[PDB]
Amino acid sequence: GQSLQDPFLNALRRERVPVSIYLVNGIKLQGQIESFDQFVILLKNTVSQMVYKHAISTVVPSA
Amino acid sequence: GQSLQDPFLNALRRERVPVSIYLVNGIKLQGQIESFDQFVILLKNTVSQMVYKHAISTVVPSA
Amino acid sequence: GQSLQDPFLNALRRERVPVSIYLVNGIKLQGQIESFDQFVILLKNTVSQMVYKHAISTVVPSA
Amino acid sequence: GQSLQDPFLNALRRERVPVSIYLVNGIKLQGQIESFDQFVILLKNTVSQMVYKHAISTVVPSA
Amino acid sequence: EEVRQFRKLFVQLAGDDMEVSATELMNILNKVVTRHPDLKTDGFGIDTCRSMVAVMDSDTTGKLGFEEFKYLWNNIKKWQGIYKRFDTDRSGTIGSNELPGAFEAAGFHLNQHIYSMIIRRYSDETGNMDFDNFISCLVRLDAMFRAFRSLDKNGTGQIQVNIQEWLQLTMYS
Amino acid sequence: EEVRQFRKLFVQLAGDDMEVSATELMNILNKVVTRHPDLKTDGFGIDTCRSMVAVMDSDTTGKLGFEEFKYLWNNIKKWQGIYKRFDTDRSGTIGSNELPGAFEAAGFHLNQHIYSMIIRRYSDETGNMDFDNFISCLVRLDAMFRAFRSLDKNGTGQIQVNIQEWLQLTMYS
Amino acid sequence: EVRQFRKLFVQLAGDDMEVSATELMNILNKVVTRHPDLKTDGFGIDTCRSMVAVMDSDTTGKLGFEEFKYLWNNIKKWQGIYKRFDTDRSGTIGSNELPGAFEAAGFHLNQHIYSMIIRRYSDETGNMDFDNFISCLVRLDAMFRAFRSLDKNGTGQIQVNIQEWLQLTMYS
Amino acid sequence: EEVRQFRKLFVQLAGDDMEVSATELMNILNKVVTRHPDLKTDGFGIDTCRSMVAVMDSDTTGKLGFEEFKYLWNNIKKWQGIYKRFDTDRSGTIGSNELPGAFEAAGFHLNQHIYSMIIRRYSDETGNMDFDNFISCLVRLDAMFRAFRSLDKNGTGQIQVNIQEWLQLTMYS
Numbered sequence: 001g002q003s004l005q006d007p008f009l010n011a012l013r014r015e016r017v018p019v020s021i022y023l024v025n026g027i028k029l030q031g032q033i034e035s036f037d038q039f040v041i042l043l044k045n046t047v048s049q050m051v052y053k054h055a056i057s058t059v060v061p062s063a
Numbered sequence: 064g065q066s067l068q069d070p071f072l073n074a075l076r077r078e079r080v081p082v083s084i085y086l087v088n089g090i091k092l093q094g095q096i097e098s099f100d101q102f103v104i105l106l107k108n109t110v111s112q113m114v115y116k117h118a119i120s121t122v123v124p125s126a
Numbered sequence: 127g128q129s130l131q132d133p134f135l136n137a138l139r140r141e142r143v144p145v146s147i148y149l150v151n152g153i154k155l156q157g158q159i160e161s162f163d164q165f166v167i168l169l170k171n172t173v174s175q176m177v178y179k180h181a182i183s184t185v186v187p188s189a
Numbered sequence: 190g191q192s193l194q195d196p197f198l199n200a201l202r203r204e205r206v207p208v209s210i211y212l213v214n215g216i217k218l219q220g221q222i223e224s225f226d227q228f229v230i231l232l233k234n235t236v237s238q239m240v241y242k243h244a245i246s247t248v249v250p251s252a
Numbered sequence: 253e254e255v256r257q258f259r260k261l262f263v264q265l266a267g268d269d270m271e272v273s274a275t276e277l278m279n280i281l282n283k284v285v286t287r288h289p290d291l292k293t294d295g296f297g298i299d300t301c302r303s304m305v306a307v308m309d310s311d312t313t314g315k316l317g318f319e320e321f322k323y324l325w326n327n328i329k330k331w332q333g334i335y336k337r338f339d340t341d342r343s344g345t346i347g348s349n350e351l352p353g354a355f356e357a358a359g360f361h362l363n364q365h366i367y368s369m370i371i372r373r374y375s376d377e378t379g380n381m382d383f384d385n386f387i388s389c390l391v392r393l394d395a396m397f398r399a400f401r402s403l404d405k406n407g408t409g410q411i412q413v414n415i416q417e418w419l420q421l422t423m424y425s
Numbered sequence: 426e427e428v429r430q431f432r433k434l435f436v437q438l439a440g441d442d443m444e445v446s447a448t449e450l451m452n453i454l455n456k457v458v459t460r461h462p463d464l465k466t467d468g469f470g471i472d473t474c475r476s477m478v479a480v481m482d483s484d485t486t487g488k489l490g491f492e493e494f495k496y497l498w499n500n501i502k503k504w505q506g507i508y509k510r511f512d513t514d515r516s517g518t519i520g521s522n523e524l525p526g527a528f529e530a531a532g533f534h535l536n537q538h539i540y541s542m543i544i545r546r547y548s549d550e551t552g553n554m555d556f557d558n559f560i561s562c563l564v565r566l567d568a569m570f571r572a573f574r575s576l577d578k579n580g581t582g583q584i585q586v587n588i589q590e591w592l593q594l595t596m597y598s
Numbered sequence: 599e600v601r602q603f604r605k606l607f608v609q610l611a612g613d614d615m616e617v618s619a620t621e622l623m624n625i626l627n628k629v630v631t632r633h634p635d636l637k638t639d640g641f642g643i644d645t646c647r648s649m650v651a652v653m654d655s656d657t658t659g660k661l662g663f664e665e666f667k668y669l670w671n672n673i674k675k676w677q678g679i680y681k682r683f684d685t686d687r688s689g690t691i692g693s694n695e696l697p698g699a700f701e702a703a704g705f706h707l708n709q710h711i712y713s714m715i716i717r718r719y720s721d722e723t724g725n726m727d728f729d730n731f732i733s734c735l736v737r738l739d740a741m742f743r744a745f746r747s748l749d750k751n752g753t754g755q756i757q758v759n760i761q762e763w764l765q766l767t768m769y770s
Numbered sequence: 771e772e773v774r775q776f777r778k779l780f781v782q783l784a785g786d787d788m789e790v791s792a793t794e795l796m797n798i799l800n801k802v803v804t805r806h807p808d809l810k811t812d813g814f815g816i817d818t819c820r821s822m823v824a825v826m827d828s829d830t831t832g833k834l835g836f837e838e839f840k841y842l843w844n845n846i847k848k849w850q851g852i853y854k855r856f857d858t859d860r861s862g863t864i865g866s867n868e869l870p871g872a873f874e875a876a877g878f879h880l881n882q883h884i885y886s887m888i889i890r891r892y893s894d895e896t897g898n899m900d901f902d903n904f905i906s907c908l909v910r911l912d913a914m915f916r917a918f919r920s921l922d923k924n925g926t927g928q929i930q931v932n933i934q935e936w937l938q939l940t941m942y943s
């Protein structure tokens with residue numbers, strides 16, 4: 001039902017807000033949410049890379 | 064649902080684009096997507112190795 | 127010192143060649159040799175900092 | 190006192206033997222001994238770099 | 253063959269040295285722009301042209317060889333087409349309301365804070381950008397994205413530079 | 426407290442909106458340069474002046490308030506004095522043989538490869554730089570050193586930036 | 599058929615009982631004249647020194663029996679592929695034909711690598727003759743085997759110093 | 771500038787496509803070498819010339835533009851001078867006893883085991899290297915040192931490559 005992930009990611013995607021994605025190993029990826037499904041986020045910076053949600057700790061908006 | 068992973072990995076496979084696969088411990092594997100299912104990616108470099116998706120953080124190509 | 131250190135550091139200083147200074151803990155400092163004595167190197171990047179020779183592993187130019 | 194290190198380094202230098210120099214933090218440098226004095230070794234690979242003896246653990250040749 | 257006609261234009265433009273200088277670029281761009289009276293411009297000036305040569309000069313000869321000029325020229329033709337299509341009010345200029353669509357069509361997905369910074373630094377008091385300013389903005393934006401990509405090897409969205417790389421990427425431009 | 430006279434000059438130059446635009450800076454620089462026939466120049470153009478305002482615009486108003494203008498003005502008067510002193514052949518231009526002395530006097534101790542890149546980007550086919558190009562080069566060089574200093578907090582000689590910080594620091598003119 | 603191979607080897611190798619670059623060139627130029635299907639300006643000495651160098655794993659400067667057998671068996675297999683993937687019967691391998699031929703040889707390469715091979719081995723029409731094709735595959739095979747042996751943890755990345763680098767790039 | 775001689779030579783060599791192919795390089799090298807019968811040589815062959823073009827072809831056009839040709843031509847002139855000077859027995863060839871001195875003069879200070887590997891691959895059964903073999907060896911050795919230096923940024927004497935960078939740096943020609 002009241003999934004909070006989809007609205008949150010869609011708002012980042014539509015307004016092209018830069019995000020930091022911290023992985024469970026503490027590494028920081030930065031770019032824009034191009035796309036996402038139940039299991040992955042397509043993150044676009046200079047390449048388009050696939051990030052598994054199971055490897056993410058946090059999505060932090062820049063603004 | 065699982066609707067973004069297959070297109071993404073199949074495009075890497077078909078065009079034989081080299082990918083970097085970063086594991087949750089930060090280690091980098093490089094080669095070609097030979098194939099994949101719900102749980103694993105067969106990565107080909109000089110051997111053909113089985114990589115568990117649950118141990119992957121990111122799959123970054125070279126476009 | 128009395129053979130190789132002074133000529134080496136003076137040549138960096140005179141031609142204003144950028145150097146990497148690696149510390150014994152593996153940290154990399156980059157700038158130009160402003161000056162040096164028996165015990166320290168004054169490194170200039172944006173500030174002028176004093177680097178103890180006892181804490182340096184390597185001085186590596188770019189030419 | 191340096192009655193064993195000078196002959197050892199001079200033989201590496203004259204025959205242009207590739208050496209590995211391990212630093213006290215475990216990092217490995219490889220090249221040729223260009224030169225050395227009481228306090229430093231000039232190591233040549235593609236750049237010419239100054240390595241402080243106080244930051245060296247071992248000099249391992251391919252002799 | 254259409255690539256053969258393009259090499260003929262390059263060789264004519266480049267003259268005695270086999271390279272296109274800032275002044276040769278300025279002269280050919282001011283000629284092309286006058287045959288398109290739909291493109292409002294106070295002209296390409298020498299300093300804008302030195303900058304365009306500088307960011308395209310990947311082998312540091314100070315001038316554009318064939319491959320540097322082809323990349324620039326094909327970008328300018330594509331961006332000319334975008335300028336006309338996204339000039340929805342037919343002002344001959346790109347307004348603040350039009351710039352996001354034009355840059356998106358050029359392949360730059362930027363956030364409003366960056367569009368505001370661009371309009372501040374390239375547009376006039378009415379927030380309108382003329383054709384030389386638009387081309388100059390895109391040449392630099394394209395070069396700065398390419399410079400960032402080449403330094404972002406692990407693809408993390410962050411790069412590390414020392415002062416010499418910083419001066420090369422900020423002054424050479 | 427003879428800085429009240431300077432503040433009065435600023436308020437006169439700024440007019441109504443109490444800030445100095447790119448156009449107001451261009452007009453006052455072109456006025457000053459005509460009183461010095463010692464300074465060879467094709468004039469300060471709008472693009473060079475928008476660039477100088479942009480790198481000096483610390484509060485992002487798009488124009489120069491008092492402290493931004495004072496810093497820029499004091500730099501321009503000091504660099505004017507250096508230009509004349511290091512113009513040893515009295516050409517009214519700074520030649521490649523004269524540029525290293527002039528930049529050293531301005532407090533920029535750069536290596537030959539950076540001087541060579543500056544001459545390639547700011548000087549003409551004879552390696553001569555006119556006054557507006559010399560001032561524009563130093564305004565940018567000074568700003569790029571200050572931007573690097575402010576991001577190098579641990580003083581390591583290396584800066585880490587994402588694409589938004591990169592575009593903010595590089596998208597100039 | 600190992601019997602036939604040892605007879606040929608002894609005859610080809612002569613006194614020093616190894617195959618030099620010159621002996622390899624002479625036997626390859628003899629074989630290729632019996633196949634007017636194979637367009638070639640001939641195997642030259644520099645291509646043959648290169649083939650001996652990448653196959654000379656014991657560093658004698660010439661090919662002993664096992665080095666020659668490995669090379670010879672590769673050449674026979676690749677000759678068969680050359681003819682089969684020459685679809686327009688030009689006697690040469692065109693840019694459109696090269697991917698299929700290399701795939702059949704067991705090299706699954708991306709188009710950017712095919713483009714650089716055609717740039718370096720093919721003529722101004724993007725056609726590769728027989729000596730160029732054999733020379734390309736002997737090197738490609740050797741460079742894959744060298745990479746495999748240095749990629750012990752199977753990460754797709756190897757580390758080399760300047761001596762290993764010069765051994766792998768110059769002795770070729 | 772008196773680099774007009776170079777430009778004249780390049781334009782005459784390059785013909786219609788205004789770039790120097792492997793075939794055009796082979797033809798000019800075979801012409802130059804016949805003027806010097808003290809350079810023993812069986813000739814520059816097409817495969818050696820494709821290899822020299824490949825390592826010098828920085829912009830991947832498959833042929834040598836002006837700047838790529840100048841770099842190669844200047845190296846060949848310098849190495850021709852070294853060949854004659856280090857041919858101490860006047861054989862017209864560089865013997866195993868001569869090769870260390872010649873390579874040292876070219877700027878390559880290598881150990882005996884590498885000199886032996888070069889002799890094994892580029893010299894004849896008497897350990898003598900003819901002129902085309904010497905130039906071909908130096909063009910490759912120079913390129914392989916430059917490739918290694920550009921990947922060894924921390925200067926540790928060790929390089930890391932994936933299979934595509936490896937194939938790019940090793941497949942020649």
Ligand SMILES: Nc1nc2[nH]cnc2c(=O)[nH]1
Binds near residue numbers: 023049086089120408
């Ligand atoms: N893109 C990317 N993903 C990672 N996952 C872990 N480390 C990295 C890294 O350096 N880059």
Ligand SMILES: Nc1nc2[nH]cnc2c(=O)[nH]1
Binds near residue numbers: 148149183924926
């Ligand atoms: N040259 C060099 N010296 C070091 N000291 C510690 N780390 C390094 C390194 O990566 N390179």
Ligand SMILES: Nc1nc2[nH]cnc2c(=O)[nH]1
Binds near residue numbers: 211212246247249
């Ligand atoms: N010989 C040698 N010395 C070292 N010093 C630190 N690490 C090493 C190592 O692996 N080998």
Ligand SMILES: Nc1nc2[nH]cnc2c(=O)[nH]1
Binds near residue numbers: 086090092752753
């Ligand atoms: N193939 C491979 N998988 C790993 N997983 C963690 N480390 C490694 C490694 O070195 N190689």
Ligand SMILES: [Ca+2]
Binds near residue numbers: 265268269273276315
């Ligand atoms: Ca020109």
Ligand SMILES: [Ca+2]
Binds near residue numbers: 310311312314317320
């Ligand atoms: Ca150029």
Ligand SMILES: [Ca+2]
Binds near residue numbers: 339340341346347
């Ligand atoms: Ca409009």
Ligand SMILES: [Ca+2]
Binds near residue numbers: 293294295384385
């Ligand atoms: Ca304009």
Ligand SMILES: [Ca+2]
Binds near residue numbers: 405406409410
């Ligand atoms: Ca990065």
Ligand SMILES: [Ca+2]
Binds near residue numbers: 442443444445
């Ligand atoms: Ca005003």
Ligand SMILES: [Ca+2]
Binds near residue numbers: 482490493
């Ligand atoms: Ca302001």
Ligand SMILES: [Ca+2]
Binds near residue numbers: 512514515516519
């Ligand atoms: Ca002067």
Ligand SMILES: [Ca+2]
Binds near residue numbers: 557
């Ligand atoms: Ca000017």
Ligand SMILES: [Ca+2]
Binds near residue numbers: 580583
């Ligand atoms: Ca820092």
Ligand SMILES: [Ca+2]
Binds near residue numbers: 611612613614615618
């Ligand atoms: Ca034999």
Ligand SMILES: [Ca+2]
Binds near residue numbers: 657658662
């Ligand atoms: Ca052998």
